[PDB]
Amino acid sequence: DTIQLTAQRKYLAEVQALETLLARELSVFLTEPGSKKTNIINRITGKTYALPSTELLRFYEHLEQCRKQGALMYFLERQGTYSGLMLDYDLKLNTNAPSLESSVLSRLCHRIFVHIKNSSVLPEGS
C-alpha cells in the first residue's frame, strides 16, 4: 500500500500541493491525541489537527482537487455532540448481485424526514 502512496504522492501535483500545505502551513495547528480541539484525523500519519474555518476552506478545496483525480486518501474528521446527521446501512445481499432507483431514494428520503419530524423538534419556519 505504501508503494501506492509513494506513487500518488510523488507523481501527482495535487497530492504534492496537499502534503506541502499540510507540512508547512497546517503543522502549527497540530493537536496532541485526545484533545477536544481535534477536528481532522489523518488515519495514515496518525496526526490530529485543529483548523479554523479560514484555512478549513483551503483545506477542503485542496482535498477536492485531489479527489477529482481519484487520488487515494483516508482523511477523517471528529464529530462532536452538535454536528450534521450521518447514516450507515450495511446491507446483507442474499444474492451475490441492487438497482436503488431514484424514486426509491425519494421514498426513503421522505420516510427519513417523517421520522425526523416525529422523533425530534425542528425549528419553526421555512
Binding site: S103, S106, R107, H110, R111, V114
Partner: protein, 135 residues
C-alpha cells in the same frame, strides 16, 4: 395512478385583465362532480392569499363556474381577434390511493417533443403521455 397538470398562460394581460388555464385531461368524472370540485375551489383561501401578492384585485372571483359546461377550445385555437393561450409549463403528479405519504410533483420533461394538441385534448383517450384515469 399518474395525473398530469398543464398551465397555459395568456401571452399578455390586456387592460389589466390576465388569465391562465389549468388542463387536467387525465381525470374523468361526471359534470356534477366537476361542479362540486369547482364549487369547493371557489372559496379556497389558500389560492386567494397566494394571489393576493400576485396583483390580483379579487382572487375570490377569478374562477368561472361555467368551466365544467362550456365547450373548451383546442390547444392552439383562439377567439376572433384573440391570441391563443401558450403552455407555460406542464406538471406531472403520481397518486397512490393504496397509501398516500407524499405527492411527488415534478415537471414533465421534453413536453415540446409531443403532439400537444393530441395530448391536451379533454376527450382524448390515446394520449402518449396523458393516460385515462377513470373516476
Amino acid at each position: 395512478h399518474k395525473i398530469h397538470f398543464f398551465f397555459t398562460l395568456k401571452p399578455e394581460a390586456v387592460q389589466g385583465k390576465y388569465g391562465f388555464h389549468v388542463l387536467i385531461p387525465g381525470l374523468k368524472m361526471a359534470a356534477s362532480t366537476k361542479k362540486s370540485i369547482i364549487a369547493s375551489l371557489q372559496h379556497d383561501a389558500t389560492v386567494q392569499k397566494i394571489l393576493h401578492e400576485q396583483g390580483v384585485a379579487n382572487p375570490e372571483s377569478c374562477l368561472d363556474p361555467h368551466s365544467a359546461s362550456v365547450p373548451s377550445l383546442l390547444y392552439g385555437s383562439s377567439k376572433l381577434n384573440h391570441r391563443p393561450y401558450q403552455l407555460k409549463t406542464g406538471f406531472e403528479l403520481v397518486f397512490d390511493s393504496s397509501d398516500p405519504d407524499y405527492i411527488p410533483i415534478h415537471q414533465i420533461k421534453n413536453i415540446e417533443s409531443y403532439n400537444l394538441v393530441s395530448e391536451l385534448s379533454l376527450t382524448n383517450e390515446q394520449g402518449s403521455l396523458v393516460r385515462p384515469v377513470y373516476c
